[PDB]
């Protein structure tokens, strides 16, 4: 059969990577953005747009090409898609160049053995056909400008990236498959292309896949268990292995080290500086110089196939190939870090390096700070001194100040969208291990925002703010973490500077959430200010937070919004509340799950606490009950509660008479909020009754949805004609009538009215309605009005 | 609710009447004859109707010709309402000779949704340099579209020119008539109000604005731009707009999606005494807690500067 012949004729290409590939092949770990690679392409829901268009994302030698080549020996094995799939097709960005127009049968007799391939027959059913396309860093060269450049005959010559760009879409050959391998950074466009992707992240091996690697590496099990227990070792070391790639080097190394009786606990002494250690153990300067400038030139010209005619240009002969390099006459890296890496090595031995920090952006996803991360490497004053000692080279020093300038740039710039993410400088930063320096250039991030995912990262973060000391306001995301939190918050109660600590949103948990409160209460932290919103805690969180405010005095405002705390939450926490140490001002307690009975706890804070300024417990099912509660409590003058809130808590009029009492008494009660409440007009009236009080001193007053009426509109002359205090209001979604609004604008005619603000959002009024708005907008500009719905 | 012989019956009186002032009349399908009968009934001398407001009220090009004789003859009305009547540019062809006149006294004229075209643009043009009681304008919702909008301005231009607060809500504009707007900017010392909500203007359409904003002759008291279909990548141009538009008072940005470092900026921008805004409004998006610490503190410290950010 053609089939069972192409398949054996892929497997006979792809049986090695020289290096079996399955028997060094291990698994590997992947989550859609864990995803089964036996379970890719059935949908997970019965209306899935076509499964054909799955993408992947992963680090610089995460596996994605290893995860190519063996989904296709699989299916050259008999493994995968045999009753699903039929025909499976390879196609490569570096053999397909972009200049060349080219055809889907160009591609087919490339990946099938035989030059004359059955076209005819296998162009019927492109169900059972899968194309490839691995390495996608490579074809978006032009698909800025070639965006309406559409073909859909598979005979037709038209440039690579075109056709690609309308295979993507699902136009020419629409109903087959495509799976794309992609680097993560640059795929804010091709998202555009893409008709219902799935994005699947991939991040390669865990700890009992590491010691399955080093077992299929090394032929000894006795030397991989003694490399398994150096990896342990070294922490560092260990946390690097999860990308395959690392681990492939380092294996490589301490075969070299013990193979020439060096020891093996070297290798893992050297941290951050894997490929320095590894090309200096392996091992001219006119070599060197050729290969570095081969790289750069490849850099600059995307090419990996590299000819003759760029070897003679950097005086490079046929005597200059070695690992590093390979022969296919074909000139190519083995993998495209080396290069990366020796093009950054290249402009310490154009070299310009400004060509480096503003050309940037002109090759999709970003190779230059790749290159550039190992340019932070080598300028290392110790790294660079161990390149000079151990080449016999020089190395320029103006690039470190260059690279610097540079750091302010990108910390200073506006646009910051076409930057790469804060992590990368963070990355290179700690790549650099330059104390001094590192703290110089960093003194510039007085914001810090960053999102973690892996070991690295959180290692690379704890590095990075430990060595921060002006920083002010700092956020965190743990996109997927005891171990995480304790490593990242043991260096913020050293850090004398933070004063600001976003979580919202992360699902830090609550286990997270205790070592956070150990972490706080730790008297050298200065944080004053603490959001944790939709954090996903619970009321075992409350006693660690009552501990942190009845420990520490440095604390300002606080968010618990969206955490389903409960009453007995609130009742944890009013125990630390109450404490006389406690300099609470702000307190959200917005969609806690709360209930009536949490209120009387309240109600003891605000005549224990005195700090707490403004409290906003809206969107609770508390009640008229609860309200009541927490008035008859709040009526003292000496309360010092300022801008409470009640939004969605399904009151009536009856806590009504509450608030009134409270406006008569209180002083300092400036805001106040009542919207979607079912006040109705007799509410309304009760709360007239304490707004004309002459001791009044509300600031403002919503009623926005309050489901309000035009019977006590006469009550809202009332209040605009005599309080002489409140200066805002809202009345959205009141249907109060032509009468009700005309009344309005002639009451508001007088100078008697200081208002200075009054919103009419959302109903349907008259054109004599608009004639008076206008009219009063007019003579007295400083009333806003927000009458336009 | 249910005329020529009922609007006659009615409307002979009306004109002896000398103290009638506003006459309301919206809604109401009188019909074209029957409006017609309340044009011969007005141009009386002894009516006093200064105001006349005809919103919905069925009519077509025919009362046109009636309403412009009304104009031509009387010198006591003000303004004049034709919401949502299928005038046509015809029918605005046929008005104009009525506006023409050197006795029309007309100071605002609603034209919303009168299914106008650009054709009737030109025509108005000449309103402009033939009436100079015509304050404020109001031809939104219609398909005019940028060559109408650049007939309009190229004569408009003129500083002679007497108008304020024109409108062209829902026009289906473009960038195009931007630089246009900016010559109006540029040149118009009366031309305080402004709208341009549901028109797809952009961020080279707000740049385009914001090149005759800048120019210190400006006199622009307020710019709307609801539903715009803004960006985040002319918003050193809205922060240039704040730093320097000394005149500009008021602002609209609802559903305009300009992110939440664009928020932040335009809250920094606001805190320096420099600016004179006195209102803005950022209704209908999804904004940040740090962009909602931001605008409560903005609030804070300067309470003149209204904000309407909540949703
Ligand atoms: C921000 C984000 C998600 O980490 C990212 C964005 O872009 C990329 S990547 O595609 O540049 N890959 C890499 O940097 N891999 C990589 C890493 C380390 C060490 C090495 C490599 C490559 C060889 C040595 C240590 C952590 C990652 C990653
Ligand atoms: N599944 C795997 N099993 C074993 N080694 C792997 C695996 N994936 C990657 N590697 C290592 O990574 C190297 C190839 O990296 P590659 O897959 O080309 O990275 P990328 O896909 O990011 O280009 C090989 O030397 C190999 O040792």
Sequence with gaps: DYCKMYRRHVRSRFYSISVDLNSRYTQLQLVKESLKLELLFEPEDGHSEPVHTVVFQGAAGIGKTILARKIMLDWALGKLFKDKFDYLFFIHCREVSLRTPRSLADLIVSCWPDPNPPVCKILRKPSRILFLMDGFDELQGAFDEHIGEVCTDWQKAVRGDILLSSLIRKKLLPKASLLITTRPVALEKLQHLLDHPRHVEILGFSEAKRKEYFFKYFSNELQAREAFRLIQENEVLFTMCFIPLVCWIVCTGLKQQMETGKSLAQTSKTTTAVYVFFLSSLLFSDYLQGLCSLAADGIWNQKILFEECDLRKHGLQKTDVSAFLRMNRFYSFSHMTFQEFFAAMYYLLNRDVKVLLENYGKFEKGYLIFVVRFLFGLVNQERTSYLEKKLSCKISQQVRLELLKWIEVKAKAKKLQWQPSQLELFYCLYEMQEEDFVQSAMDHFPKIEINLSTRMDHVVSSFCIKNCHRVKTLSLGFFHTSSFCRGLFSSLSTNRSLTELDLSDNTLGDPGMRVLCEALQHPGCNIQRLWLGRCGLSHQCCFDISSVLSSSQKLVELDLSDNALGDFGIRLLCVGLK????????????????????????????????????LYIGENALGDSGVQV??????????????????????????????????????????????????????????????????????????????????????????????????????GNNDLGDLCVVTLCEVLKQQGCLLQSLQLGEMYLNRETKRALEALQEEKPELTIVFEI
């Design 630 to 731: 927490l008035c008859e409590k709040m009526k003292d003058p000496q309360c010092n509660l300022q801008k409470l809130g009640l939004v969605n808590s399904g009151l009536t009029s009856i806590c009504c008479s509450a608030l009134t009492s409270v406006l008569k008494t209180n002083q300092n009660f400036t805001h106040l909020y009542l919207r979607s409440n079912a006040l109705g007009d007799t509410g309304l009236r009760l709360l007239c009754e304490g707004l004309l009080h002459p001791d009044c001193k509300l600031q403002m007053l919503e009623l926005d949805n309050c489901s309000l009426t035009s019977h006590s509109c006469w009550n809202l002359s009332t209040i605009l004609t005599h309080n002489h205090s409140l200066r805002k209001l809202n009345l």
């Design 579 to 614: 404490h006389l140490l406690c300099n609470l001002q702000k307190l959200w307690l917005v969609s806690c799950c709360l209930t009536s009975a949490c209120c009387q706890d309240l109600a003891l804070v605000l005549s224990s606490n005195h700090s707490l300024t403004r």
